[PDB]
Design a protein around this ligand. Structure first.
Ligand SMILES: [Mg+2]
Ligand SMILES: [Mg+2]
Ligand SMILES: [Mg+2]
Ligand SMILES: [Mg+2]
Ligand SMILES: [Mg+2]
Ligand SMILES: [Mg+2]
Ligand SMILES: [Mg+2]
Ligand SMILES: [Mg+2]
Ligand SMILES: [Mg+2]
Ligand SMILES: [Mg+2]
Ligand SMILES: [Mg+2]
Ligand SMILES: [Mg+2]
Ligand SMILES: [Mg+2]
Ligand SMILES: [Mg+2]
Ligand SMILES: [Mg+2]
Ligand SMILES: [Mg+2]
Ligand SMILES: [Mg+2]
Ligand SMILES: [Mg+2]
Ligand SMILES: [Mg+2]
Ligand SMILES: [Mg+2]
Ligand SMILES: [Mg+2]
Ligand SMILES: [Mg+2]
Ligand SMILES: [Mg+2]
Ligand SMILES: [Mg+2]
Ligand SMILES: [Mg+2]
Ligand SMILES: [Mg+2]
Ligand SMILES: [Mg+2]
Ligand SMILES: [Mg+2]
Ligand SMILES: [Mg+2]
Ligand SMILES: [Mg+2]
Ligand SMILES: [Zn+2]
Lengths: 100, 115, 127, 211, 224, 83, 131, 100
RNA sequence: CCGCACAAGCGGUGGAGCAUGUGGUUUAAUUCGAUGCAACGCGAAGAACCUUACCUGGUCUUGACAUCCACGGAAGUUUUCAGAGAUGAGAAUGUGCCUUCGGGAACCGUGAGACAGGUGCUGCAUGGCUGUCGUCAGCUCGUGUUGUGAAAUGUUGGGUUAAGUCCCGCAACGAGCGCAACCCUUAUCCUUUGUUGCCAGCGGUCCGGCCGGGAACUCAAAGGAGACUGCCAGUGAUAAACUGGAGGAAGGUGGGGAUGACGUCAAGUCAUCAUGGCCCUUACGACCAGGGCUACACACGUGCUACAAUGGCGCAUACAAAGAGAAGCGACCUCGCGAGAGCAAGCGGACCUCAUAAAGUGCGUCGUAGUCCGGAUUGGAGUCUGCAACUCGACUCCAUGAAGUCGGAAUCGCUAGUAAUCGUGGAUCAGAAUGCCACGGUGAAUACGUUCCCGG
RNA sequence: AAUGU
RNA sequence: CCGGGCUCAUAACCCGG
């Protein structure tokens, strides 16, 4: 994963963190059943205005170590390529081959 | 019995013989039989003409058969006049709601022919 | 006195609390016929008594749990056989010779890497 | 045929998990990451130490670290001077009070990793690899009275075509679970390309399992 | 030993006539019925002088070795050796026993070691299967090494029941220049023997005469 | 499609551009990229140059297409027959 | 198997009667382990045959089986190094097995409306030895 | 009456046995009534990733984590008992929870 | 001599439709990689945007990413205008912190270079990791040997195994790596700890282990016993071995798992990562919006649902296993034909939720048919996530009802709790399981045997 | 079935 | 004639239109 990839990701996450409350509040507004049509309309209009990356979805759960954008484990924050090694160093505490 | 136009429901259980009416799926059939207060099971036979006639009235409320298709054609012609993605694939005999065109398209494209 | 035995088949467990009685059959506080939809399992479970032809003289207070209809039936039988010889030793020789006594051990396979099933494999491509 | 890691096979009873702290799923990934960061920092600090192994510990909301090296003094520092230089930053990355512990390796020839690191160093210093393997296995057989296996792989001798070679002495029942093998590997930089190393040291047919 | 003793001992018997064995037409009294007849009159001097040499050998502290693979003398060889505490091979001559004594020493070590553990009895610590295996193995070793384990080194001379049945041992020993005292029967070759007793090599009585005279001589010379 | 509760969608810059154009009576074709923009009645009788990944395709708004996208009338791919 | 000999697997006798033969019939007839339905069908066709012909369900069934049991086979075996279609004798167990398999094939091919019906008619044919 | 309840989590059954030993003895000496630690069913999490880089797609290997559980409850515990339990500190691999 | 290599069984592929992968063709672009077996539901454990490496346009040139110098400002917060956006232009704003009192640390901007940057090349320069023979029973060394030597011998021959397993004979003697074993799981019995788990026997109960009680029973997890050819027979060279019998929960490797002996394919991976060496520096680097990765005359691979009475449809009613839950899982109650909406308890979870298993079974109905079969396609209209479902999402209702009635040549798999058949979970993950990995329930036939295959 | 790295 | 089969190929032969 090229450095530029990672720069993008870090910037994205930081910025997404920035606007979290604003966006959640406006979402609450928009979804509200009884809310004024005009207020809903204005809220929707404004939401466009926020930075596109702000949305949490645009992220990608890359492997922490290699940053490989596939075979990622949340339980470990790493690509599959690494967990085998780290597991077999016995460093992963209590991690052992499963033979049941 | 002749019903809902020149259609003849065969003498099977009233509900299904009634589904025989094009534009009438099982839902509508069950609905009509309920409305008439007529046991769905009954054959088309053994019904006093008046029951048949109230059924005729009932089906009257539908959009059915020739007008149904007429509307379908109007919708599709309307769609076809547009020049959009959907209309173009409609006029090209191609999947229109987004299935792969590489393979598995016979029912729309038709039997395989040589290249 | 109280006579007890435990039974296990497939993945099922059965408690057989059984006492000198009248042969009444209580399974989960239910009639045997109400328990198993067909006599089949009833036929199967009754057999151990059948050998002794002493089918009439115990009171059966019974549990079975887990697995399915058939494994459960088998567990019921196993527990009954044990609890019976557990009740009386001297019957044991005829019981084992009569082939009642063993415990079945067969069980299932796990699904495995590269297999759709225990012993089935994807299509091979002919070459 | 390609092999399974000796440590992994022996990990369940014979080989200790270099880490054994507890965590929920919640902390787990970052606990691992902190262990990774610290150890890499430690390795640079401990490279002179050439410590055989490092365990990271998380007693009571606080971390702890133990290090095994060939020389206690090198890693520690006079009057315990340098150790604290490490303790500062390790407590920092750990985000928690940290403390260092040092266990001396008493027979460095008997450490797979140490042997490998030495071999690799000499390789990078253009010592003939074959001589290196010879003398290393020599020491090992002299001292341990127990089998040893060794291997090297790469553009041996700077040849235009790569190859690998290995050497064995004594018993090395890798297959047996009871047998315990000190396994490790290493890296030996080359003016052209890369050279790898791997080691297996049998020490004694265990009786008594993990205990 | 009288010649009459040799005749009574059947020393004069002969092997069936053999094609292309004309090496020894001389030194035979005669032949008939495919029985070659040995010249015992030669035996008396050859025998007595072999004993004369052996007496000195034993007086040297000479380590004799007795090799027997003709089963009829397997017991006798051991008995004569043990009569002078000398070493013996009643068993097969597994080969290499001299030429790679370098190798054999290790086997000697392991025999000693298993003996030591038997005296420890620590086999019982192991699984019964393994312990019975250990006993089996130790016996298997003792079956052959028992008659030689004690010498600690190469003997001083070989005694051969039959230049033929003991062939391989002679072949080996010649490489070291070890003297060979051997019985040569008709259809058997002295070519490899140092000291020879002309006599039948497949009669127990002849074996007995040889071995008795030999053992008496070795005992006296050893005991001076 | 979009939940009814959610209401319609149009891209704000585009809405501003169209409101301004209609007010001015400028009536020149509108460059855009907002395919996702939904067609509204107020934009009837107007013209829009919809980007298609390569080029902005001219399109004449009419009541019929109201409620459609703008990208629906600006094909992206191409195909002229294998043979 | 190539190397060495093997036996065969034992199965339950039917609780209703105890005719292992019937056990094998239900087994060979069963599909997808649906033994309950199979035995239901078997009993139905059994009765509707015996009670329309013969004295006793089991006895009628047996004699019917008999009436079709073969004795010889031709399936080739490479005894002479080639695929000779040498006719050799058939094992009584194998005789029964083939009989059952055949009769069930016939009932399968007999018709659409009742499996129980098809079967009973097949076995009526067998007992009468014109089928 | 006052009820104190204790649960324990770690990756090694033996370790947890010994910890409990400490937990019970320390409460026994102090004289509080002690409930013998109650064994409980353990969880085991399982995983597997492709063990091979690039194209070869078979050979994923699996691993498992087993987390053992033990529970102790104290009734009418002595205050000294309570603080004594508080005094005990468990090994780093051990995780402890206490509740009243 | 051996093993799904044939034979005897069971049931599929190959035709129908669709899903998915791939060849070709096409396009501005349809990013790159994997190839008989051993590529082709493969990398990818999840392409709307991001992802994303390509196309198109708009942009930057010490730079998106790091240090180093100088220089200027706390940081940051709120907000307007242009632009599709990237960006540009402004406004107020902050106005701080440690300060030895010098400033410094903070951060931020600009300038100077040194450098930064590559998913750019080479798997035939490499390391690491992986496929393949093949869980195939083999593979070698020391000493010795004898042979002039080149060597072979060991490792062959006689019995016996799953096996270089073992016995016996034996110029060879002995050793190591494979084999077996030490490990998990699974089967019978015991000790020990009893809530959130247990209820045989007590007492009460609205009958709800509901609660009093109970530690029996089941069960939970730690530690123990348990199978050895040990026993009887027989047989065999007394050998080893083999056949039967008892005993026993379990009998001869009880079953299953892991574990892959030396090495072959200059097999694959420079795109996880590492790197020799080699190419590019206002660009082969970087930023922005939309487009593509899903096209569509054709060929191929893997699969899902089928062509029906063992079945179709309606009503009622039995019995499982294992997993996952804190921005989580989410009850009860209300709203809706429905996808869902609203309100909100509990549970970090033997306690609460996901979440009522489906096959089975009582009653009824359907009468062989393009069907009450099959279900695609198409129209209309809805729910949800998401900034945002035009290209291109899943899901709900009405209506529409293809092909298809067992499928050539040819070909795949399986020996028991297996095949087949029927449900459950989890991971990647906002949203997207006919793929992938586990879990139960129900549950068989066949095996003469080694002659033709096939690879050893 | 002939020729083929 | 074309397209599918047969091989590790390219033929022979084989299948489908
Ligand atoms: Mg995403
Ligand atoms: Mg319909
Ligand atoms: Mg009661
Ligand atoms: Mg329940
Ligand atoms: Mg696959
Ligand atoms: Mg299943
Ligand atoms: Mg493996
Ligand atoms: Mg076959
Ligand atoms: Mg390549
Ligand atoms: Mg603007
Ligand atoms: Mg600058
Ligand atoms: Mg290669
Ligand atoms: Mg190549
Ligand atoms: Mg050899
Ligand atoms: Mg084998
Ligand atoms: Mg108790
Ligand atoms: Mg004999
Ligand atoms: Mg015997
Ligand atoms: Mg027995
Ligand atoms: Mg055994
Ligand atoms: Mg093994
Ligand atoms: Mg973009
Ligand atoms: Mg693609
Ligand atoms: Mg239907
Ligand atoms: Mg969900
Ligand atoms: Mg049709
Ligand atoms: Mg719609
Ligand atoms: Mg199915
Ligand atoms: Mg599923
Ligand atoms: Mg999930
Ligand atoms: Zn003689």
């Amino acid at each position: 994963a090229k450095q530029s990839m990672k720069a993008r990701e870090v910037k994205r996450v930081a910025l997404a963190d920035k606007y979290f409350a604003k966006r959640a509040e406006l979402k609450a507004i928009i979804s509200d059943v009884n809310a004024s049509d005009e207020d809903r309309w204005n809220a929707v209009l404004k939401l466009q205005t926020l930075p596109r990356d702000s949305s949490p979805s645009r992220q990608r759960n890359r492997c922490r170590q290699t940053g490989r954008p596939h075979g990622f484990l949340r339980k470990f924050g790493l690509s599959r390529i690494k967990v085998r090694e780290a597991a077999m160093r016995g460093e992963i505490p209590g991690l052992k081959k499963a033979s049941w | 019995a002749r019903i809902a136009g020149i259609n003849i429901p065969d003498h099977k259980h009233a509900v299904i013989a009634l589904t025989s009416i094009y534009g009438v799926g099982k839902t509508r059939s069950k609905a009509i039989l309920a409305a008439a207060g007529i046991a769905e099971d009954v054959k088309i036979s053994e019904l006093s003409e008046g029951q048949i006639d109230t059924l005729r009235d009932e089906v009257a409320k539908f959009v059915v058969e020739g007008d149904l298709r007429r509307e379908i054609s109007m919708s599709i012609k309307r769609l076809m006049d547009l020049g959009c993605y959907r209309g173009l694939r409609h006029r090209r005999g191609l999947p229109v709601r987004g299935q792969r065109t590489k393979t598995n398209a016979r029912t729309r494209k038709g039997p395989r022919k040589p290249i | 006195n109280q006579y007890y035995g435990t039974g296990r088949r497939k993945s099922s467990a059965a408690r057989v609390f059984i006492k000198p009685g009248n042969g009444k059959i209580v399974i989960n506080q239910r009639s045997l016929e109400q328990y198993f939809g067909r006599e089949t399992a009833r036929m199967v479970v009754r057999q151990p008594l059948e050998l002794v032809d002493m089918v009439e003289k115990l009171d059966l207070y019974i549990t079975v749990k887990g697995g399915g209809i058939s494994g459960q039936a088998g567990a019921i039988r196993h527990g009954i056989t044990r609890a019976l010889m557990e009740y009386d030793e001297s019957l044991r020789s005829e019981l084992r010779k009569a082939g009642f006594v063993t415990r079945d051990a067969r069980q299932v396979e796990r699904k495995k890497v590269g297999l759709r099933k225990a012993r089935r494999r994807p299509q091979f491509s002919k070459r | 045929g390609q092999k399974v890691h000796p440590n992994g096979i022996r990990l369940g009873i014979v080989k200790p998990w270099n880490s054994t702290w507890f965590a929920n799923t919640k902390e787990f990934a970052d606990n691992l990451d902190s262990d990774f960061k610290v150890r890499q920092y430690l390795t640079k600090e401990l490279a002179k130490a050439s410590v055989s192994r490092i365990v990271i510990e998380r007693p009571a909301k606080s971390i702890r670290v133990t290090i095994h090296t060939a020389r206690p003094g090198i890693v520690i520092g006079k009057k315990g001077e340098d150790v604290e230089k490490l303790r500062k930053v390790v407590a920092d990355i750990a985000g928690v009070p940290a403390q260092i512990n040092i266990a001396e390796v008493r027979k460095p020839e008997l450490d797979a990793k140490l042997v490998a690191d030495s071999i690799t160093s000499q390789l990078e210093r253009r010592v003939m690899f074959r001589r290196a393997m010879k003398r290393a296995v020599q020491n090992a057989m002299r001292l341990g009275a127990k089998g040893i296996k060794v291997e090297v792989s790469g553009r041996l001798g700077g040849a235009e075509i790569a190859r690998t070679e290995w050497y064995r002495e004594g018993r090395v029942p890798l297959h047996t679970l009871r047998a315990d093998i000190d396994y490790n590997t290493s890296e030996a930089h080359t003016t052209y390309g890369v050279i790898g190393v791997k080691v297996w040291i049998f020490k004694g047919e265990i009786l008594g399992g993990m205990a | 030993v009288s010649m009459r003793d040799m005749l009574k001992a059947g020393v004069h018997f002969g092997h069936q006539t053999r094609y292309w064995n004309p090496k020894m037409k001389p030194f035979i009294f005669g032949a008939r019925n495919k029985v070659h007849i040995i010249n015992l009159e030669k035996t008396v001097p050859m025998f007595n002088e072999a004993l004369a040499e052996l007496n000195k050998i034993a007086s040297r502290k000479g380590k004799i070795l007795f090799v027997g693979t003709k089963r009829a003398a397997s017991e006798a060889v051991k008995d004569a050796a043990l009569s002078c505490d000398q070493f013996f091979v009643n068993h097969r001559w597994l080969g290499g026993m001299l030429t790679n004594w370098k190798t054999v020493r290790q086997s000697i070590k392991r025999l000693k070691d298993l003996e030591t553990q038997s005296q420890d009895g620590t086999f019982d610590k192991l699984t019964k299967k393994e312990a019975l295996m250990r006993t089996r193995e130790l016996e298997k070793l003792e079956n052959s090494l028992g008659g030689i384990k004690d010498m600690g080194g190469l003997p001083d001379a070989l005694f051969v029941i039959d230049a033929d049945h003991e062939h391989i041992a002679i072949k080996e020993a010649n490489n070291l220049g070890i003297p060979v005292f051997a019985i040569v029967d008709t259809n058997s070759d002295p070519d490899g023997v140092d000291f020879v007793i002309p006599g039948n090599d497949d009669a127990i009585r002849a074996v007995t005469l040889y071995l008795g005279a030999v053992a008496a001589t070795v005992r006296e010379g050893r005991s001076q | 499609p979009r939940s009814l509760k959610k209401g319609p969608f149009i891209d704000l810059h585009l809405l501003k551009k169209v409101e301004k154009a209609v007010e001015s009576g400028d009536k020149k074709p509108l460059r855009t990229w907002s395919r996702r923009s939904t067609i509204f009645p107020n934009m009837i009788g107007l013209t829009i140059a919809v980007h298609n990944g390569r080029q902005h395709v001219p399109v004449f708004v009419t009541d019929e297409m109201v409620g459609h996208k703008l990208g629906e009338f600006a094909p992206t791919r191409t195909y002229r027959g294998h043979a | 198997p190539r190397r060495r000999v093997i036996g065969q697997r034992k199965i339950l006798p039917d609780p209703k009667f105890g005719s292992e033969l019937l056990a094998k019939f239900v087994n060979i007839l069963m599909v997808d382990g649906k033994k309950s339905t199979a035995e239901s069908i078997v009993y139905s066709a059994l009765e509707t045959l015996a009670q329309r012909s013969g004295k006793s369900e089991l006895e009628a069934f047996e004699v019917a089986l008999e009436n079709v049991r073969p004795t010889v086979e031709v399936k080739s075996r490479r005894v002479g190094g080639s695929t000779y279609q040498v006719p050799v004798e058939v094992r009584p167990v194998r005789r029964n097995a083939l009989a059952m398999r055949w009769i069930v094939e016939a009932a399968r091919k007999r018709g659409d409306k009742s499996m129980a019906l098809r079967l009973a008619n097949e076995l009526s044919d067998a007992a009468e030895n014109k089928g | 009456n006052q009820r104190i309840r204790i649960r324990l989590k770690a990756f090694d059954h033996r370790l947890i046995d010994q910890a409990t030993a400490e937990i019970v003895e320390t409460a026994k000496r102090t004289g509080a009534q002690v409930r013998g630690p109650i064994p409980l069913p353990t969880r085991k999490e399982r995983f597997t990733v492709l063990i091979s880089p690039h194209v070869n797609k078979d050979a994923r290997d699996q691993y498992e984590i087993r987390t053992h559980l033990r529970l102790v409850d104290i009734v009418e515990p002595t205050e000294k008992t309570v603080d004594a339990l508080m005094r005990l500190d468990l090994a780093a691999g051990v995780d402890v929870q206490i509740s009243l």
